[PDB]
Design a protein around this ligand. Structure first.
Ligand SMILES: *[C@@H]1O[C@H](CO)[C@@H](O)[C@H](O)[C@H]1NC(C)=O
Ligand SMILES: *[C@@H]1O[C@H](CO)[C@@H](O)[C@H](O)[C@H]1NC(C)=O
Ligand SMILES: *[C@@H]1O[C@H](CO)[C@@H](O)[C@H](O)[C@H]1NC(C)=O
Ligand SMILES: *[C@@H]1O[C@H](CO)[C@@H](O)[C@H](O)[C@H]1NC(C)=O
Ligand SMILES: *[C@@H]1O[C@H](CO)[C@@H](O)[C@H](O)[C@H]1NC(C)=O
Ligand SMILES: [Ca+2]
Ligand SMILES: [Ca+2]
Lengths: 280, 98, 278, 98, 62, 62
């Protein structure tokens, strides 16, 4: 398994491979394209992955999407691997979780104007830095904690602090938000990571591919801190339905694909069964 | 006779007396002990001048009290009414006998 | 929107056409127009708009008869100068100035808040108010403008009324230094026109906006707003205008200030520090 | 009461009581005054936990005592036996409430 | 026809940052504009001790 | 520091198992300073021999 950084390392160590890589990069960014394709289908850049929380993930993804030829699903460039009161108490007794926790809270709970509720990009940056370098027995315990009443569900909803990040003035079109997320490098890669690990299945007994709860939970929590950042819909104790901040309105004749894209978050038996079995 | 250093204790938020209506528990680091062999020539001379009343009869301190050096930065929590709070400089990180 | 056809629910588009300005219109516009709008649904639709831009009169009531106590201190609010339509201006800057008649008894000043576009009297000098010579003062309040130089003027009569009593020996310079109730009113700070500081008393309901404190004016200092008068020199109202640190369970204001506190809250503006404790 | 800072004094060598036999006069500096604008949230929490007796019954400090930050280097003098003596750290150089 | 240094501010002298100051003393003229200039190095030296509680503002009050 | 706690406890360097107390004079800064030593012939001797310099807990006052 060769990641794209070392694939560029072996690419820059050779003359023909670098020539065909820069040739295809000048093609994308007939006959010049097809020869570069039939050469670089044997490159170490061909089928290179990236890692979660690796150093210079952005360059790895910019290299990986550079060789990609120009669509509901895409290939993931990654390695295919009171209760909530007690979760917060287990965080605040460690030192690494406490510092970054107070970091994203003291950033995201700063009202600026009576119009601007909070700063968006710094709050997303703090949430990404929280959900990258914290051990996952702390994140999953605070974000997924089994509740029986309304106050526990409200604490669990308020954990990613949706008053700044999740909600907006309007609910835009889900397809437009998908286009915005697929414009950016990082959000498109996290969305493909979520699509590769959290589809429904008719063959496996838990409707999840490879019967892997862990990959679908990591593909869920890796979408926090982007524009396609989901959260719960209400403070329901047992009813657990996640959703991004959009809706099916404004769809036109593209209504069915919008509904099918939204049913990945609203009506996934794989993700809901994974959350329920993790709560058990 | 124990050396002055960090002492840790798990405490409620509402037992800290800061009026935050919350029941979470955080760890608390405070400086505790007794400074005995830290007296200097400054300390002895100032004590003797208090014994001779050359002083201008003010508030002075002629025993080295053990205090924190640098505090922890931030502790954030949520209340009983779904609203976060960020307390700056709650516990100590280093204890020095000055 | 969802409309019914035969007991069903289909959806359709409701387009909204609104009409938006492009710049700050001045006062001197006295026009009217009709605007025509083409709509192409590529079926060809026409819309109209009767717009009427009417100018604004800027006259004021002519004489603002008012008084001031002799015990007052520097930077204390007295009265409000404003146009007849105070809360009508949005994008027209209106500034207020003074012209003393004798040019020897300069005591007061006017600064303009651009929220209400209105001016507030403030005591600038103590000695000129302290003199028994400059006891009834006549000012020409001139209401000016920035964009188009239409202006007006008016009369200001003010009477220097009362007696003078010295303050105590150990008084600080601001009202908020005191902590109990008695030492607040038995000493005089800076911003009050009464010469003594006022005490407002809160509640025992935890971290509230109703925090017990000592202010110059109970209608001005714990107002939740830092106006133009308080922001001149930071000793007047520290509990609405500071940029500092707070010791005690609280919540700070949105640009600045103390939004909510617990217990009694005093402030040292010389160190930009505040304390809240029962 | 007064704020904490430097106060000067001029005292004899043998009036320090250290056993020296001389009559020269040294310029003794000291930190004096009151700490009322230095208590922090740590101090309030420590005071409240002393009130609820959750403490392990050790010696703590919930009033920030004003001590010198640094100290002066040397004091050189001569005595009744005609012998030079240099003493280190006799007075302060900067005061702060800690 | 000579100039005398005077302390204008206390706080800037009180700062430990502005401890060695370099000024361009410019000797000017009124009638004919021939002029010159020179260097001024000054060192902020010593310690600071607060005054007493009941002090007046002038020396001659005592 | 006092006399009783010196002899009612045993340190390191003494072959007697208890510490010895020598008592000085009130003549100011003298060589005859009252102290608690392991041996009154070895520790306040004015000389740091080979035995005391092995581990520095034996005779700190030499
Ligand atoms: C605006 O123009 C009309 C035109 O007849 C005039 O009557 C009116 O007085 C003008 N407005 C003002 C404020 O003078
Ligand atoms: C509306 O747009 C179409 C598309 O260009 C154009 O052919 C048509 O002429 C337009 N309608 C009018 C009234 O110009
Ligand atoms: C707008 O102006 C035209 C001009 O005559 C007039 O006919 C029409 O009635 C006006 N609109 C309304 C709503 O009065
Ligand atoms: C319009 O008026 C407001 C009023 O304060 C001012 O802040 C703004 O800069 C003005 N803008 C223009 C384009 O004149
Ligand atoms: C207040 O008085 C000072 C000094 O006399 C002067 O500089 C200042 O301009 C006055 N304030 C106003 C608003 O004129
Ligand atoms: Ca105010
Ligand atoms: Ca020896």
């Amino acid at each position: 398994p060769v990641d794209c950084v070392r694939a560029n390392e072996l690419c820059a160590a050779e003359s023909n491979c670098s020539s065909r890589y820069r040739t295809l990069r000048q093609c994308l960014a007939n006959k010049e394209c097809q020869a570069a394709l039939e050469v670089l289908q044997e490159s170490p850049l061909y089928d290179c992955r990236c890692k979660r929380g690796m150093k210079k993930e952005l360059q790895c993804l910019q290299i990986y999407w550079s060789i990609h030829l120009g669509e509901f699903y895409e290939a993931s460039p990654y390695e295919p691997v009171n209760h909530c009161l007690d979760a917060a108490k287990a965080c605040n007794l460690n030192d690494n979780c406490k510092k970054l926790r107070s970091s994203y809270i003291s950033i995201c709970n700063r009202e600026i104007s009576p119009t601007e509720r909070c700063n968006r990009r710094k709050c997303h940056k703090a949430l990404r830095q929280f959900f990258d370098r914290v051990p996952s027995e702390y994140t999953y315990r605070m974000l997924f904690c089994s509740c029986q009443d309304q106050a526990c569900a409200e604490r669990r909803r308020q954990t990613i602090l949706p008053s700044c990040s999740y909600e907006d003035k309007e609910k835009p079109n889900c397809l437009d938000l998908r286009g915005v997320c697929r414009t950016d490098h990082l959000c498109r890669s996290r969305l493909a990571d979520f699509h590769a690990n959290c589809r429904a299945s008719y063959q496996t007994v838990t409707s999840c591919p490879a019967d892997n709860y862990q990959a679908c939970l990591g593909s869920y929590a890796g979408m926090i801190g982007f524009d396609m950042t989901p959260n719960y819909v209400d403070s329901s104790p047992t009813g657990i339905v996640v959703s991004p901040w959009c809706s099916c309105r404004g769809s036109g004749n593209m209504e069915e694909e919008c509904e099918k894209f939204l049913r990945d978050f609203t009506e996934n038996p794989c993700l809901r069964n994974a959350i329920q079995a993790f709560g058990n | 006779a124990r050396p002055c250093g960090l002492r840790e204790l798990e405490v409620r938020v509402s037992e800290l007396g800061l009026g935050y209506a919350s029941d979470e528990t955080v760890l608390f680091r405070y400086c505790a002990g007794a400074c005995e062999a830290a007296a200097r020539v400054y300390d002895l001379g100032l004590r003797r001048l208090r014994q001779r009343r050359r002083l201008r009869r003010e508030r002075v301190r002629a025993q080295p009290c053990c205090r924190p050096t640098a505090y922890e930065d931030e502790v954030s929590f949520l209340d009983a009414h779904s609203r976060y709070h960020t307390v700056h400089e709650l516990s100590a990180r280093e204890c020095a006998c000055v | 929107t969802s409309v019914q056809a035969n007991g069903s629910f289909v959806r359709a588009t409701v387009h909204d056409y609104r009409l938006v300005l492009n710049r700050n219109l001045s006062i001197s516009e006295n026009r009217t127009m009709q605007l025509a709008v083409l709509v192409n649904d590529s079926g060809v639709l026409l819309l109209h708009f009767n717009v009427s831009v009417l100018p604004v009169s800027l006259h004021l009531p002519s004489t603002y008869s008012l008084s001031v106590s002799r015990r007052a201190r520097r930077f204390a609010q007295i009265g409000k100068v404003c146009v007849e339509n105070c809360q009508a201006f949005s994008g027209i800057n209106v500034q207020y100035k003074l012209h003393s008649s004798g040019a020897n008894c300069s005591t007061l000043g006017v600064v303009t808040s651009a929220e209400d576009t209105s001016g507030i009297l403030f005591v600038n000098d103590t000695k000129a108010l302290r003199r028994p010579k400059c006891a009834e003062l006549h000012y020409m309040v001139v209401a000016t403008d920035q964009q188009t130089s239409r202006q007006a003027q008016a009369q200001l009569l003010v009477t220097v009324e009362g007696s003078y009593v010295a303050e105590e020996a150990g008084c600080p310079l601001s009202c908020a230094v005191s902590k109990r109730r008695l030492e607040c009113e038995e000493c005089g700070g800076l911003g009050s026109p009464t010469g003594r500081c006022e005490w407002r008393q809160g509640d025992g309901k935890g971290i509230t906006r109703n925090f017990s404190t000592c202010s110059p004016s109970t209608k001005t200092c714990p107002d939740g707003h830092c106006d133009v008068v308080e922001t001149q020199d930071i000793n007047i109202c520290p509990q609405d205008c500071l940029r500092g640190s707070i010791v005690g369970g609280h919540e700070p204001g949105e640009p600045r200030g103390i939004k909510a506190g617990y217990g009694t809250c005093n402030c040292f503006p010389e160190e930009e520090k505040c304390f809240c404790e029962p």
